[PDB]
Design a protein around this ligand. Structure first.
Ligand SMILES: CCCCCCCCCCCCCCCCCC(=O)OC[C@H](COP(=O)([O-])OCC(O)COP(=O)([O-])OC[C@@H](COC(=O)CCCCCCCCCCCCCCCCC)OC(=O)CCCCCCCCCCCCCCCCC)OC(=O)CCCCCCCCCCCCCCCCC
Ligand SMILES: CCCCCCCCCCCCCCCCCC(=O)OC[C@H](COP(=O)([O-])OCC(O)COP(=O)([O-])OC[C@@H](COC(=O)CCCCCCCCCCCCCCCCC)OC(=O)CCCCCCCCCCCCCCCCC)OC(=O)CCCCCCCCCCCCCCCCC
Ligand SMILES: Cc1cc2nc3c(=O)[nH]c(=O)nc-3n(C[C@H](O)[C@H](O)[C@H](O)COP(=O)(O)OP(=O)(O)OC[C@H]3O[C@@H](n4cnc5c(N)ncnc54)[C@H](O)[C@@H]3O)c2cc1C
Ligand SMILES: CCCCCCCCCCCCCCCCCC(=O)O[C@@H](COC(=O)CCCCCCCCCCCCCCC)COP(=O)(O)OCCN
Ligand SMILES: CCCCCCCCCCCCCCCCCC(=O)O[C@@H](COC(=O)CCCCCCCCCCCCCCC)COP(=O)(O)OCCN
Ligand SMILES: CCCCCCCCCCCCCCCC(=O)OC[C@H](COP(=O)(O)O)OC(=O)CCCCCCCCCCCCCCC
Ligand code: HEM
Ligand code: HEM
Ligand code: HEM
Ligand code: HEM
Ligand code: SF4
Ligand code: SF4
Ligand code: F3S
Ligand code: F3S
Ligand code: FES
Lengths: 146, 238, 539, 122, 129, 120
């Protein structure tokens, strides 16, 4: 008697011939997307140093930290183009940075391609929701809400 | 003679698939390496213990294994300056196969994934087609460019210490990128563009999370992550 | 038992094997068998350069190279073979460089060269700076280049296949080589590769000595196979003992003392090579340096970094022709059986190997054997196959596995190696060689009852260690009977009983034939004449 | 089958583990921050309510932990960016790591001192 | 004139692409990997499917149900080394994304092949890979 | 290799995902407009102004506009690709589609973002 042959089929949706030993490895995505996601993480990190650490400083350490924060404080800060643009840049840079990072994390912790697909879809959904909600609140804010 | 204890991760592929560590007591002179003690085990006490080794001391890269946590290439573990030589007390050395490649027997892994990833970056010289019959000319400063990646003995001490290689997907690994750097940065080569296009995918060179496990594990001292950086820079300034 | 059909089968993937594969790959349908991975081979342990008369930094023609080879061999080389080696050595180095090899470059940028050992200007005048190099790692680069080319041309590799036998089918016009019976380490299966041509590139055998520089996997198996089939073995008593050998263990130091003024001091702060060989202080031939070291450590003027001679190279092996065909007489040839590298004895090195000629040898004659075997395979046709050729090998494996004796393979092998390095080492005598003969016969009767403790089938290294000990014992007896026959002192073979070269009675190659089939047998010794063209002996 | 193995490698490996963990921490917190701030478009009183519940001692300790996360992520990200851009980066890795350990220590103890004063005076 | 049909057929490379040194003894494949590309090995190449596809009656050059079936056969074959290249052929503007999920092909096949489920499996192999 | 690589795969996926979202968006819009209190017979500027004084309905209508226009524009791209015989006709029809879609998205976004209840 002999040794039973090894099954090459990972999952139903995966062509085994894709992980053939002698098969040519060729790029499996949009060309030059990884280069620019890599460069984006670097540049947006350089910007986020200033944006995020200045936000944290001014919030927690300046006068009375969180113990001064309320609606009137927010309404006085957002009456200034400086802080409006600062918070919009912070929201957009931080969400795209974090979403690309979690793209990487999912890509190397998800074992099945179906899990990877659906987790990337959930990630894109959550990031889009947070971006549109934050952008709406920033753009359409009025201190005289009541 | 000090009587070290070796704790080896055993695995018999056929008869039982139910086995973990085993401890052997072996004498240890100070002019010993770990391969001498593995030989003592295999010759005298055990003999089911199966590892790889070829050379005397001209490095071939056969016996990469995981010793006390780190990938160490057994023949070089030097077994000399034992710190418990200060307090007289029991010693233990934990030995197990390298991680990421399928185990075939205790301390013997399957290196075919490693070599299939290596010979996918086209690791050979590609030129025009009119051989000059007279030793293609190259500067003594074009020579020193791709140097330091010509020392790869292909032992997989680097690839099998990359967290990104333990992870999912199919990362090329540090060793494939070392042996591709060797040719990309060669003056007398005519395929740098296609090699840089091979290394420019999702599973290529952008999956390095800039851990230096590879640089710390290489037994030749190759600066594996500096090679990976130079490939990244050649790809982004283009 | 599996069956394969290939045109050319190469046994060995070292320097010579992968060179022959590079050549015979495009032509025919070739396979390569290796007990290792291709890049794990001894060749990669080579650090010295590769010598050729290119004349880039100085001026030299290949004739001075040829004379220096012939005189280094102590007048036992074949001048036709030496000629061919040099005048093809130029193009061998050039083709290595054109395959991708990273040589060190000269201020212009062609190839840098350096001086080495006993290379002379012209007939013993001055250094000549012949040796090419890549770094402190030349053999590693050569091996990587050959492997990258075998990857380019998509050669089929059967890694970890211990080729255990060959199948000589007896045609009415003599024997002919048809197949190779191999043992897959990974599964325990026997494979039969039926071929038209067979190339043997299995490297040397220096592991019958306790203190040696060779790999742990250089037991000598092409030699043992060819010797068990009834074919002869040539000049096996000529072992080269490198002088600098890590007096403790056996590793090589070929780098330091050659490069710079490393003086060899004995015990007292005293040099000796200036009195044992003038006209050169310590860059004399390796055999002379080792005789001097052994003599002084023997006469009581040694210590007790230290060094001591280590067995390094075997100048004998399978007797071939300049094209690679394996002889079966002094004249005849086995059809479809070639050999290259350190297992082959074209007798280029003769009685002493000149440094940096081995990488040259393997390149030149591996290419020659490759093209020769490719031509033969494309010209002829499959011959036959005996009744179930793997019968002997399967019975041998089965019966060495299936019982429980009372001896230890490690003990038998350690006894063999200790006895050889005591008696059949740098200095030999009749009484010591007879003692070693009795020792080897005792160990051959002990080997009859050993224990393989594994009994498994998947990765059985203990089985193969016993099988390799068999080859070690055969080759040890061949060496001892040859060295007991040759009553002179030529090259690597020195004898305290007859310490002067006898150019009238012993200027011939020794050839040994095995009589029986079991281990304990008889060794019949014949003689083969040495070819001469221009160079004549002189002290 | 699965074995539990601590690889015990470079300190860059633990820097990378901490970088990944702190980055994901900031991502999830930011989801929550953006929601509770979106609460500023419904009324002043709702916003005031939820942030008054964000001014407790437990959430003060949590804000110290978030300061630590953001600070380490920023510093190690500067190190990573330098490794990737500066051509002598990979040499001086493991000196950048000591530098940022020291910087984290000083900035973090200063920030925790200020925040602890604010939390005491209440 | 069946030559447009057969030109679309022999454009998905409907042959086994492999290494270059055959194993002399019928390279191995499991009875589990074998039963995967079954049900697309029944195609007699009659064109009853491609000539019922409205997307094929339309403009451009849609490959067709039959070409996609005979490419599914080779993409889901273990002993093949061009699955990725075939999937890259079917991933164009006129490849597998022009199927409007009409089941005319499935209804017309005389061997009963489930042509549109083969097309769906190729689509999902392009989504999750 | 006729167009941008992997553009068709993502247009396909976008049609699926925008369909899943547009179920709720478009059908809730139609319900609340036509069959809640008086249907169309209650609709006027004051109704629009008190509906668009709510973040809920503002974001609802902007998401509806953007998803519906990109969905319809991709679908009509497919229809044009299946019915246009000449390459010049396909070019100019895709350009007209892109122009009309851009104009409608610009106008709808302007109206939503800039709407003020107190205009006269
Ligand atoms: C509160 C504040 C917190 C902030 C929240 C932030 C927001 C989230 C950000 C996202 C970031 C990613 C988070 C994880 C990071 C990495 C971790 C990781 O990779 O682990 C993977 C790792 C991989 O394991 P595996 O062995 O490869 O897979 C085994 C399968 O689980 C075994 O199952 P399987 O093999 O059979 O297949 C798995 C499954 C898919 O696996 C999944 O579980 C993914 C589920 C995603 C939900 C889909 C939503 C899509 C929305 C589309 C809209 C556009 O495949 C399916 O069967 C298909 C089912 C999915 C159907 C989806 C469509 C249904 C709804 C659509 C219409 C709805 C109508 C309205 O383990 C996990 O699966 C962990 C699950 C992750 C859960 C994290 C939860 C975080 C948020 C929860 C908030 C509370
Ligand atoms: C009011 C509410 C309604 C909502 C409106 C929605 C708006 C967006 C609509 C988007 C979708 C459009 C319709 C989709 C249905 C697709 C059906 C289909 O494709 O069948 C084509 C069907 C068969 O196509 P075919 O057999 O291959 O070609 C036969 C040609 O008709 C025979 O022609 P030919 O053989 O002589 O050669 C082709 C010819 C004809 O090419 C065309 O058909 C083009 C027609 C579009 C007009 C071009 C506007 C370009 C705007 C550029 C802006 C960027 O092209 C030329 O000769 C080149 C000259 C054109 C130059 C145009 C540029 C000049 C202005 C640029 C500068 C402006 C200065 C300021 O026949 C049609 O072409 C029917 C046209 C459909 C009319 C559009 C209906 C809706 C728009 C009406 C608005 C009121
Ligand atoms: C430490 C050291 C340093 C050296 N330095 C130099 C130097 O500086 N210059 C120089 O010229 N020479 C040097 N030499 C010698 C020189 O390298 C040899 O002449 C040459 O390497 C011989 O190689 P080969 O191709 O004959 O086979 P090797 O490279 O010796 O290896 C034989 C190959 O055949 C295969 N094989 C062997 N047995 C079997 C079997 N039974 N079944 C299947 N396959 C098998 C193996 O896979 C192996 O790779 C050195 C040797 C040593 C040991
Ligand atoms: C040697 C010196 C050290 C060198 C490098 C040190 C690097 C270590 C710093 C990284 C700390 C990572 C912590 C991340 C997790 C975390 O603490 O956050 C959670 C909080 O968990 C905790 O409770 C942590 C408790 C505070 C202690 C953290 C400080 C530890 C650092 C000590 C450094 C050595 C001194 C979640 O809080 P939140 O974001 O959800 O808050 C929401 C606010 N509304
Ligand atoms: C506080 C905010 C700090 C943010 C700053 C980080 C950005 C640094 C990286 C920017 C990219 C430029 C760069 O660093 O590269 C240059 C090198 O720059 C340097 O020399 C960097 C050395 C010192 C680091 C300066 C950064 C200081 C920030 C750290 C302190 C913040 C705490 C070019 O050198 P080269 O090797 O590529 O030359 C080849 C070109 N032909
Ligand atoms: C790519 C993805 C893009 C997603 C876009 C789809 C949006 C579709 C419509 C969603 C609108 C959301 C805006 C919310 C405004 C609102 O309701 O708030 C507006 C409401 C008025 O609603 P009504 O007039 O309809 O009753 O004001 C209130 O009085 C509400 C009382 C408390 C509600 C708290 C909600 C604040 C934030 C919490 C959001 C809940 C999400 C939870 C996720 C985990
Ligand atoms: C304890 C720590 C923090 C506190 C108390 C805090 C508090 C706040 C406050 C007061 C605002 C809005 C008011 C204004 O902008 O003036 C806000 C909004 C915001 N914060 Fe934070 N913040 C903290 C940490 C962070 C961090 C770590 C990040 C990013 C990594 C961040 C990113 C943002 C963004 C992007 C907004 C904009 C919200 C929007 O656009 O709707 N904040 N947070
Ligand atoms: C404050 C300044 C920041 C800097 C300097 C910075 C820098 C970086 C860099 C260079 C990377 C790439 C790391 C790698 O590829 O190995 C990274 C990854 C990441 N960042 Fe940031 N970042 C900052 C802030 C943030 C913020 C605000 C968030 C989330 C809201 C975030 C989330 C992430 C995540 C999740 C990763 C992935 C970690 C990984 O993949 O290992 N970071 N950061
Ligand atoms: C009889 C059916 C419909 C009626 C009476 C109607 C009525 C309205 C009304 C009253 C508004 C603005 C006021 C508000 O949003 O509160 C509006 C805007 C809008 N409607 Fe409809 N609608 C109908 C069907 C549809 C359909 C079928 C769609 C899309 C498939 C749609 C999409 C939109 C969009 C996107 C807006 C936003 C306009 C803008 O942003 O400028 N509506 N429609
Ligand atoms: C404003 C609302 C909508 C517009 C303007 C619209 C328009 C279109 C158009 C023109 C097509 C092309 C049809 C074809 O290519 O055969 C299409 C396709 C499609 N629609 Fe919509 N549609 C709308 C709403 C919806 C809704 C509510 C769903 C709910 C699931 C949906 C699901 C789909 C799907 C899945 C397709 C792709 C059909 C295919 O690829 O065969 N659509 N849409
Ligand atoms: S790089 Fe260093 S470690 Fe990685 S393989 Fe080559 S030698 Fe072994
Ligand atoms: S109908 Fe069934 S059989 Fe005829 S072609 Fe289409 S698929 Fe092949
Ligand atoms: S081990 Fe792994 S991720 Fe980067 S630097 Fe070395 S490769
Ligand atoms: S007939 Fe045509 S479009 Fe789709 S499912 Fe069948 S192919
Ligand atoms: S045995 Fe060759 S490197 Fe350890």
């Amino acid at each position: 008697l002999g040794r039973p042959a090894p099954v090459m089929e990972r999952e139903h949706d995966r062509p085994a011939a894709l992980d053939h030993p002698r098969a040519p490895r060729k790029p499996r995505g949009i060309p030059y997307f990884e280069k620019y996601a890599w460069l984006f993480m670097r540049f947006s990190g350089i910007a986020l140093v200033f944006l995020a650490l200045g936000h944290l400083f001014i919030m927690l350490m300046w006068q009375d930290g969180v113990y001064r924060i309320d609606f009137n404080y927010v309404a006085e800060r957002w009456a200034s183009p400086f802080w409006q643009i600062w918070d919009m840049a912070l929201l957009w840079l931080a969400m795209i940075h974090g979403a690309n990072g979690m793209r990487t994390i999912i890509g190397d912790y998800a074992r099945k391609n179906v899990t990877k697909f659906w987790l990337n879809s959930l990630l894109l959904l959550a990031t889009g929701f947070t971006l549109v909600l934050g952008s709406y609140v920033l753009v359409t804010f009025d201190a005289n809400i009541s | 003679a000090v009587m070290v204890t070796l704790k080896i991760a055993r695995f018999n592929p056929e008869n039982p698939d139910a086995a973990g560590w085993q401890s052997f007591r072996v004498p240890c002179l100070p002019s010993d390496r770990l391969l001498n003690l593995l030989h003592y085990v295999k010759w005298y006490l055990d003999g089911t213990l199966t590892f790889r080794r070829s050379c005397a001391h001209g490095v071939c890269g056969s016996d990469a294994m995981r010793i006390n946590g780190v990938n160490r290439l057994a023949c070089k573990v030097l077994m000399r300056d034992m710190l418990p030589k200060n307090p007289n007390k029991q010693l233990t050395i934990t030995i197990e196969p390298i991680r990421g490649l399928p185990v075939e027997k205790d301390l013997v892994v399957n290196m075919e994934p490693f070599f299939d990833a290596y010979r996918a970056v086209k690791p050979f010289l590609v030129t025009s087609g009119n051989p000059p019959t007279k030793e293609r000319i190259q500067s003594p400063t074009d020579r020193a460019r791709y140097d330091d990646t010509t020392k790869c003995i292909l032992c997989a001490c680097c690839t099998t210490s990359c967290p990104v290689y333990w992870s999912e997907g199919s990362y090329f690994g540090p060793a494939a990128i070392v042996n591709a750097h060797r040719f990309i940065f060669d003056s007398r080569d005519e395929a740098a563009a296609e090699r840089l296009d091979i290394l420019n995918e999702v599973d290529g060179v952008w999956r390095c999370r800039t851990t230096f496990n590879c640089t710390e594990a290489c037994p030749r001292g190759i600066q594996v992550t500096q090679a990976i950086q130079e490939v990244k820079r050649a790809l982004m300034f283009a | 038992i599996q069956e394969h059909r290939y045109d050319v089968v190469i046994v060995g993937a070292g320097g010579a094997g992968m060179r022959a594969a590079v050549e015979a790959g495009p032509r025919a349908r070739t396979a390569v068998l290796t007990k290792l991975y291709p890049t794990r081979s001894h060749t990669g342990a080579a650090q010295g350069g590769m010598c050729a008369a290119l004349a880039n930094v100085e001026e030299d023609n290949w004739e001075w190279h040829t004379f220096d080879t012939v005189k280094g061999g102590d007048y036992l080389a074949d001048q036709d073979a030496v000629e061919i080696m040099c005048k093809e050595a130029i193009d061998a180095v050039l083709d290595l460089e054109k395959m991708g090899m990273p040589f060190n470059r000269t201020p212009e940028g062609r190839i840098d060269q350096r001086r080495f050992g006993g290379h002379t200007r012209d007939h013993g005048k001055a250094p000549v700076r012949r040796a090419c190099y890549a770094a402190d790692r030349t053999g590693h680069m050569i091996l990587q280049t050959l492997y990258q080319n075998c990857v380019k041309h998509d050669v089929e590799f059967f890694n970890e296949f211990y080729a255990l036998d060959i199948a000589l089918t007896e045609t009415p016009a003599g024997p002919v080589a048809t197949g190779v019976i191999a043992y897959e380490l990974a599964t325990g299966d026997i494979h039969v590769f039926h071929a038209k041509a067979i190339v043997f590139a299995t490297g040397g055998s220096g592991r019958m000595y306790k203190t040696t520089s060779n790999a742990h996997t250089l037991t000598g198996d092409g030699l043992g196979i060819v010797f068990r089939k009834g074919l002869p073995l040539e000049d096996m008593e000529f072992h080269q003992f490198h002088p600098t050998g890590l007096a403790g263990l056996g590793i090589l130091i070929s780098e330091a003392v050659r490069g710079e003024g490393g003086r060899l001091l004995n015990g007292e702060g005293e040099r000796f090579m200036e009195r044992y060989a003038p006209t050169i202080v310590d860059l004399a031939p390796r055999d002379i340096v080792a005789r001097s070291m052994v003599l002084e450590v023997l006469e009581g003027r040694g210590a007790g970094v230290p060094v001591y001679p280590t067995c390094h190279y075997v100048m004998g092996g399978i007797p071939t022709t300049v094209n690679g065909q394996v002889l079966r007489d002094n004249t005849n040839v086995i059809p479809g059986l070639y050999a290259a590298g350190e297992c082959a004895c074209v007798s280029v090195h003769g009685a002493n190997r000149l440094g940096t000629n081995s990488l040259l040898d393997i390149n030149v004659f591996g290419r020659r054997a490759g093209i020769a075997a490719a031509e033969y395979a494309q010209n002829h046709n499959f011959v036959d196959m005996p009744e179930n050729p793997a019968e002997m090998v399967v019975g041998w494996v089965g019966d060495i596995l299936s019982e429980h004796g009372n001896e230890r393979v490690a003990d038998i092998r350690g006894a063999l190696q200790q006895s050889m390095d005591n008696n059949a080492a740098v200095f030999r005598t009749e009484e010591t060689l007879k003692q070693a003969l009795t020792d080897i016969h005792a160990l051959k009767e002990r080997y009859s009852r050993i224990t393989v403790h594994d009994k498994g089938k998947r990765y059985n290294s203990d089985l193969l260690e016993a099988i390799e000990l068999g080859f070690l014992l055969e080759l040890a007896e061949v060496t001892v009977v040859g060295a007991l026959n040759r009553k002179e002192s030529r090259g690597g073979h020195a004898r305290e009983d007859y310490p002067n070269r006898d150019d009238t009675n012993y200027m011939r190659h020794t050839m040994a034939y095995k009589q029986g089939t079991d281990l304990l047998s008889d060794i019949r010794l014949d003689y083969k004449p040495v070819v001469q063209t221009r160079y004549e002996p002189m002290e | 089958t699965r074995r539990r193995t601590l690889y015990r490698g470079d300190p860059g490996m633990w820097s990378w583990v901490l970088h990944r963990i702190t980055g994901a921490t900031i991502f999830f917190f930011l989801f929550v921050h953006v929601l509770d701030t979106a609460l500023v478009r419904v009324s002043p009183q709702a916003y005031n309510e939820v942030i008054e519940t964000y001014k407790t001692p437990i959430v003060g300790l949590m804000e110290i932990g978030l300061v630590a996360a953001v600070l380490f992520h920023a510093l190690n990200g500067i190190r990573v960016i330098l490794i990737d851009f500066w051509a002598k980066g990979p040499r001086y890795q493991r000196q950048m790591l000591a530098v940022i350990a020291g910087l984290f220590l000083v900035i973090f103890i200063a920030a925790v001192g200020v925040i602890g004063m604010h939390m005491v005076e209440r």
